[PDB]
Ligand binder design. Sequence first.
Ligand SMILES: *[C@@H]1O[C@H](CO)[C@@H](O[C@@H]2O[C@H](CO)[C@@H](O)[C@H](O)[C@H]2NC(C)=O)[C@H](O)[C@H]1NC(C)=O
Ligand SMILES: *[C@@H]1O[C@H](CO)[C@@H](O)[C@H](O)[C@H]1NC(C)=O
Ligand SMILES: *[C@@H]1O[C@H](CO)[C@@H](O)[C@H](O)[C@H]1NC(C)=O
Ligand SMILES: *[C@@H]1O[C@H](CO)[C@@H](O)[C@H](O)[C@H]1NC(C)=O
Lengths: 99, 49, 50, 47, 49, 49, 113, 79, 98, 44
Amino acid sequence: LGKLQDVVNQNAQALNTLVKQLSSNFGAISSVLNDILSRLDPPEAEVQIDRLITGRLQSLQTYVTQQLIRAAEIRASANLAATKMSECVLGQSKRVDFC
Amino acid sequence: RLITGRLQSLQTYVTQQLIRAAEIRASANLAATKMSECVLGQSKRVDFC
Amino acid sequence: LGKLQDVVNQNAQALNTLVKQLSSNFGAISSVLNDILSRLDPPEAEVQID
Amino acid sequence: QCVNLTTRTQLPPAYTNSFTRGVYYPDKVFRSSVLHSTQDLFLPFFS
Amino acid sequence: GWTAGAAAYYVGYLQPRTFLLKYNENGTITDAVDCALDPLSETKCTLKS
Amino acid sequence: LTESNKKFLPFQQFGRDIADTTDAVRDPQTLEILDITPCSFGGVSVITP
Amino acid sequence: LTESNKKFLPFQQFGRDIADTTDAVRDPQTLEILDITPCSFGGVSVITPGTNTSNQVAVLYQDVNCNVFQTRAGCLIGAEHVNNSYECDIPIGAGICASYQTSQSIIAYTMSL
Amino acid sequence: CSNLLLQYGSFCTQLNRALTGIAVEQDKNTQEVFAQVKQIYKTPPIKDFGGFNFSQILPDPSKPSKRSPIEDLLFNKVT
Amino acid sequence: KRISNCVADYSVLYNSASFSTFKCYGVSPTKLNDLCFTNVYADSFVIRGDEVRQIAPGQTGKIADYNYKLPDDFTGCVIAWNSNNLDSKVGGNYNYLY
Amino acid sequence: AQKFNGLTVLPPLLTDEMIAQYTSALLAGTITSGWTFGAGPALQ
Ligand SMILES: *[C@@H]1O[C@H](CO)[C@@H](O[C@@H]2O[C@H](CO)[C@@H](O)[C@H](O)[C@H]2NC(C)=O)[C@H](O)[C@H]1NC(C)=O
Ligand SMILES: *[C@@H]1O[C@H](CO)[C@@H](O)[C@H](O)[C@H]1NC(C)=O
Ligand SMILES: *[C@@H]1O[C@H](CO)[C@@H](O)[C@H](O)[C@H]1NC(C)=O
Ligand SMILES: *[C@@H]1O[C@H](CO)[C@@H](O)[C@H](O)[C@H]1NC(C)=O
């Protein structure tokens, strides 16, 4: 099956990539926020934590977009399935090449 | 700042393209249904074909 | 009515939140852009403006 | 101490081909049922 | 006049390349796939499968 | 730190998963494979009549 | 640097286009107009017959101009071209596909409608 | 890290609300596709349908699961 | 100097009340001992009083660019103090080079 | 053009020739069989 497998594989790859985002520095000197706090003073390390905020916010902002787009296409798919359920199953549909 | 400036232009185009790809697919699905009903048969749905 | 009230409330809460976005500093030292221009020189406050 | 050798007839070196050799663990972590890629120093295959 | 028995040692130089490593449930390496050797091997390591 | 059922090779100190999260570490002294699992899961919800 | 057929006004040096890219320059040696066109177009692509079927693969270039067959969609190497037309399974582009048929090798042909 | 999040606490409001809207819409999709009827119709014990064999699509009482034999094949086919 | 397989605190290294300058970008003094570091190195050398200013991340000069370049992430704490009664002598002390 | 900065254009799988050849066969079936060619074997 392709239509039932892509909706799951695209999530797992997208869910896996969110984990991959925390492994990147976003132009900073470290990936984990705990390291720069443990090796630099908070007054000086405010720039590195701020660019980690913006990089992680943008990745979350990016992730929300295609999830909203993926929610839209399945909503079209669920609407198509609902119409097919009401027409092809709950009666006989006269629409040719539809069921 | 040039990297993130040129980055920020890209997903704005990508999100725009993804929305444009969504409405093309919706229009293609409407044309496919019109192809299956209006041409490949006679459709009883009035004011549709 | 549910299908008619959501399209108005969601727009209203989106319109309201845009106003709320201007009340945040985004990591800067003030929210209103006129404050840093009054108390700091434009050559120094360029990074806070940007 | 060491001594010196005398001139004699030797054989020229030969060249052979490797077959999936020169693979080691690149790190000291445990991984189970995963396919991950690392950028380290390895022997190229069929080199 | 000397004897050395019979031996053969191979010397090879390592190069920096990306390698795709396979792991089983016991945790040992079973196979490795390069990315700069064959176009087929490149497809295997870009798809991570 | 739960009691696991998988053993490590006697040269590895850490252990990761498919999602590349360190969820298994062996003790330096007693060589015990202790799994790692976070405690804070999800949020809270309120049911209002 | 191709030989263009458009003459520049005798006071200019460079030349732009609709997309605002410097693709035309005048050589100051004897005042000839030369166009500018990038040499790197697109990327590479690989055709795989699949698992448990074959081992060889065919390499496809997207927009690079050149066993080796000059297809409409670039250069296809490693796959022979056959004038016969059948139904295809692996799309390539511009009405041409690739498939593994009869030993047996990877062939490229026009898709039969 | 949480102190600097207050400057982007408005940003986290839409993200939590979008996924809440996504989750409630995914929930709402199931009732629009499956819950057409408000009455559960029981399969009659008589399987004499004039020669039509329906054991492949109707659920079987041999297994504890209520899935059809083709549904069980469908369930195990997709990961 | 490389310190390995050792326990080293830093409160005793700070309460001497004799260091003239204290440029430590490692951690604040209260939180510099609770957490862990893998390896603490020691780069000890001598310098004049007018060149301690140039030893900082992001500065130029004739010593910080030609003898020891400081990276942007220079977490190394610089502890400097005056000991002119031992390393200098009358008649001209020229035993130190740069 | 718009391809000078790596913004290449991928040609479609089906060009205008076979899309026209699709429409001609669809037009030929409609005028010679009605709707039975779109719902099974093509009658006359
Ligand atoms: C309906 O079809 C099913 C096919 O699954 C039939 O069940 C098979 O019947 C044969 C005949 O005895 C057995 O050998 C098979 O083992 C059965 N398979 C299964 C999965 O049960 C069933 O008999 C048919 N019923 C009718 C009334 O035709
Ligand atoms: C490797 O895994 C198999 C299970 O497939 C198991 O039977 C075997 O004991 C394992 N090897 C070792 C050395 O434990
Ligand atoms: C590709 O290059 C060759 C030689 O350089 C040339 O003969 C051929 O016309 C080129 N192809 C196109 C489509 O211009
Ligand atoms: C296919 O047949 C035509 C018929 O004229 C011929 O011109 C062409 O060269 C043939 N192609 C090949 C690859 O042999």
